[PDB]
Design a protein around this ligand. Structure first.
Ligand SMILES: [Cl-]
Ligand SMILES: [Cl-]
Ligand code: NA
Ligand code: NA
Ligand code: NA
Ligand code: NA
Ligand code: NA
Ligand code: NA
Ligand code: NA
Ligand code: NA
Ligand code: NA
Ligand code: NA
Ligand code: NA
Ligand code: NA
Ligand code: NA
Ligand code: NA
Ligand code: NA
Ligand code: NA
Ligand code: NA
Lengths: 205, 206, 206, 203, 206, 206, 207, 206
């Protein structure tokens, strides 16, 4: 499995002249104002991944952020609500064309309440995501090989997931519903950053 | 004064709604659109008058009301439009899509309270007292009582004024584009409820 | 104004119950029939009068009342008959079979509220103010107070009129055979409580 | 060695169901019948074989199956019939009258345990291991899917016989019968909008 | 109005407690006897008068009061004696063991309610209105305000009458020996609390 | 060897129980004594052997066993006696006076844990693995399985040894008189359960 | 009502009314979340029966006179539930006071016979006073505050001096003075912990 | 495997603790210092060795240990020092001033997990599998077992290394002054526990 490890940013975008990119982040935790962005992982869906180490206090990542704001490229996330929040918070740029496999799962896998990426991978691809490195020091100067491998595998499968979910969304006639959710998702992430992370803004109470 | 025009089935015409924003509210037999039918639709232009339209059981159309709801040039103002949008779309087959919700607006601006009910908002923003005593009554009755007609009309009489104040607040706190994205999703949030996700926050992690 | 006939043990005859439906309520020392004995049985024909029957500790029979409760040609009207059927069957060894329950009926028609208590229903459907101050008193006292006699009577004075309204609403919402099935099972539901399943919804998944 | 006959849409005929009681189960896209369509109906006569019927999306009719469902001289056996009766009636418009439910039966007899799932029941009563390990709307079911679907009806006759012995011994037969008589209306109540409500509760 | 004798440290003598049963109550700085000291001990013979005894910080003895509490021929009547026995035993080192508790008696007889507070019991059994406004105040104050002494006294004024009524109920429902056994264990239930088991129902399965 | 004697109805005689203390356990159809009958009674003298007695449906007497249960010179050792005393007394009409409970003893001595089940206690104190697999089986079967017989016996085989250890800990931690008072109340706690207070901590404030 | 209240824009004109040992402090905001809900008003009483009400503007970053007061080691800052006020004051102006007294902590250390420790409840019991919490829900960011708003904000500091005195009496009586002192010393860091991201976390709990 | 010195009562001297920081752990009869006595104190200098000190019931003095505990030139390292400080100060009357707590450190640095127990911390930071089997054993036994001794020594063996790693993370994330202030308050937090506030977050709004 080719994993390309970088300091700061992609060297260029030669591997990303594509319709859709898989994106994932690693952080020091779930609170963007407290827990910094540590890693950004990318994949074109060709079985290879780029793992990008983000330094403490890093202000720019010009090639990556160009990708994130290219409206002709769909950004695929699993639970992008999280990734979009810490990415926009770090680099000041909120993507607006996105696909989320966790939203897709909740719209199609109506026979389960387990929508984690591990469960989705095991069910739709018979691929075993190992969640051991999830709780590790992602801010470490040098990432372990197990850290690099775990971070890369969280992006390696998202294109295949996207294709299967797109089939299910069409079969159950929920395409326009999913699209509206994906359209709002950047604003749902913004709401989190502005102080509404604990509030379902559409709830009655 | 307290002018309330009560109608059977539909508005007779749209003469009173050559305007850019109409206040809308409904009454039903309950909170479950597949079980509890639409019984009343209330409208107001904001001129202190109100229109109250009784909806018959099994009624599938209301062409004048539905033209108003369909008009992309007319904003439909609701309090908690998530509810009204769902029952209206389920009954008449059309989902409005230019909307404004005073409850979402309140949750985006009245950040100092967990009380965002229409009664609370009217009390604090306008010093108008709203009585919820008829909220739980037989809205399906063939003839509505006078207390019933007045309660229903007062739920739309004040929404124009609330919208103006919330728009000031959304501007002052720089939350206009946030509020607009929420209103853009609201019709689909209501479709999610009809489709079977009414108990699910679709954006939650678990 | 309201005539209340008080009896010890049993009605003297059934001269006042040559009718097709009788309102029935009970008073007890509490909610657990194996521990809390039946203290009072109240009956009404629907004519604005009531009979209040004091049941002695250890009383095993009441022939006239039990004949009433066994008469399949006479519907027994309860509010939440699930409770009354259990204590009645436990005390006298007879489970009434032809019943109407205003609380089930409320849950089947008053779909716009979650308050299905008798006091709530009387206020909304009849504009009649039950007072619940005497519900918590010593119903086993040798002499019932004037307040107790009044309260016990008022819990059967309106069940006929409630039934007529709920029956109209069940017809309107096309829920008659649903209601009839629930009333059919209700004696068995009360038997289930006596047998040991009072805490279990027998139909729940878990 | 378990014979499983797979069908598209309906049984071809009723030659294997000239019987007093049939085991019935379903697979769906989820627990909410207004959203999650019927995908599979499974039947067994109790002879160790099963019929697995694939229900197409949008399918309105299944004449042989539905004839069975509405034949009052044939008892429909379920595990938690409340669910299956709801999706069957919602899909084909016919609510069965004459039913037997092993989950209700378990709750009336297995008073020594708090676990009334079919897997728990089979393990204890029959020493049989049910495995509950998917997309039931797939065009082609997998071998594992076909076998899981059949295994949920192969045991209900034997479970029913044992539960009848326990209902008789504990003198709860007429209690069970009344619960079975109400069960179709309980499923109907679910479809009308009372799925979250114990209709007999005080509050 | 109410004759209340206020003392510092102890009763001046025992001349008013040559009786069969005494009503006892306490005031503290809180519910945790290792942190919250005893501040007041109230007594009454049931004659309409009460003694209110101020306890000093660090006071280790109260000879006349503790004589009463140790007297086996004198029943001590508490409402929720579990609390009073704990703090009385902690402060003075003597644990009464001839006791009667109106809360336990209420839970054994007033099976038609779940409200067993003293104010609730006083209202129902005696039509007497205990006011609880002074419950949360500085009972450690050097000088108790008239409001406090009146509140302190009212908590012992009625325990004799309540005991009589509950003893009739315990006889009627044939629970006398049940009540006796619970009263017998109550000093040890208080000890269990002081020893570290106050959050544990020692008899619960889990 | 583990010799288990199986009996129908009662012990043949008391020749194996001329002892100071007897281990007792029961099996039933469930946790509700008014619904779930006594099925098995198990006894052990602590000599490594056990008697397993099958109780028939509707059995009213067991003269030798019940002689043991009311012999005040023999302590009856249970694990969670609150349960066994209730079903035994409910079945045969005789409530023991003199008991020891290993679960209460565990709650008073094993203050470092919240797991007080028999299996847990046997594992820690004796390094004896009790299997709980047969705990939920049909105990009313005409013929018990060998696994059932061996499971039933093993619930009484270790209670004497547990008693010895808990008594050592009660002594070391100076809690003997606390335990004794708990054991003295335990029959009345079980009696309160049968009378209708099974869900009530009678000593709780609320 | 109508006690003397001096309403200011932005800051105090000077500190002439604050050559004292302890100052009563309170704030009004748009909510409980300092990173979202801006500081709107600061209220001060010297204990002399008068009060100063300071309008804070959106985006305002300095209040030199006020901040001098908050930074003064010789002047104790008295709050009710200072955990909140310290966080929003530190967040808006960049300065965290560290000589503080809190009547809610003190209430939790002395009023051990109750579980109601809000300012309303303390004032009713200790002083026989009503602090009409009805204006708690109003627009504290309005251009012009109402007379009703000015008097509610002012009354939330008129009583803190008398409350401190009664509580110091209680801490002395129950021998908890050094316990209260330790709690007050940590309080500014408890406020910092909230701003930094631990507002939902009892940092000392086992879990 | 590792050198463990077992002592009765106290260290013989401080020859092994002429150091800047000492790792400290205790074993007890439970979580409640007023009820559950100190049984064992464990120490380590960080050199791979440990001292295991058996504390007798009623023991009032441990002069060498307590000299260590009050030496302000020696940092005392705990995991969840809130517990150990409370029981140590309660037992010997001396509260350490200068402490470091790995669980507070963890809550301030391991912000990517919600599991802060010592086992989880060792697993992640050191790849060290702490066995927690001996947690539920009789720590007050006269003679500890080798498994007990070895489990007791295991905790303190890693605290110096954990401290070093946690200090690196506190420096990296710029939280050292935050941590110092928490460690400075920690002895008063343990004091609050002994004084009666163990269930109370003293800094919370409610
Ligand atoms: Cl049928
Ligand atoms: Cl005995
Ligand atoms: Na992700
Ligand atoms: Na990741
Ligand atoms: Na309305
Ligand atoms: Na609405
Ligand atoms: Na009734
Ligand atoms: Na009644
Ligand atoms: Na199935
Ligand atoms: Na047919
Ligand atoms: Na089933
Ligand atoms: Na008391
Ligand atoms: Na009192
Ligand atoms: Na057993
Ligand atoms: Na037992
Ligand atoms: Na404040
Ligand atoms: Na304030
Ligand atoms: Na330890
Ligand atoms: Na520790």
């Amino acid at each position: 499995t080719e994993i390309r490890v970088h300091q700061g940013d992609l060297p260029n975008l030669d591997n990303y002249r594509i319709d859709a990119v898989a994106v994932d982040t690693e952080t020091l935790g779930l609170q963007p104002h407290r827990d910094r962005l540590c890693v950004v992982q990318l994949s074109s869906g060709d079985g290879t991944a780029d793992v990008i180490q983000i330094a403490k206090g890093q202000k720019s990542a010009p090639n990556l952020v160009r990708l994130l704001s290219d409206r002709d490229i769909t950004k695929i996330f699993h639970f992008g609500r999280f990734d979009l929040a810490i990415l926009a918070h770090t680099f000041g740029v909120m993507p607006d064309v996105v696909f989320c496999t966790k939203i897709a799962s909740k719209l199609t896998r109506t026979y389960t309440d387990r929508h984690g990426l591990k469960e989705i991978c095991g069910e739709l691809l018979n691929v075993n995501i190992s969640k051991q490195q999830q709780s590790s020091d992602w801010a470490a100067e040098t990432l372990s090989r197990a850290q690099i491998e775990y971070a890369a595998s969280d992006v390696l499968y998202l294109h295949r997931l996207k294709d299967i979910f797109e089939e299910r969304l069409k079969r159950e006639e929920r395409e326009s519903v999913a699209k509206a959710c994906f359209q709002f998702l950047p604003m749902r992430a913004n709401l989190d950053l502005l102080g509404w992370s604990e509030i379902d803004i559409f709830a009655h109470s």
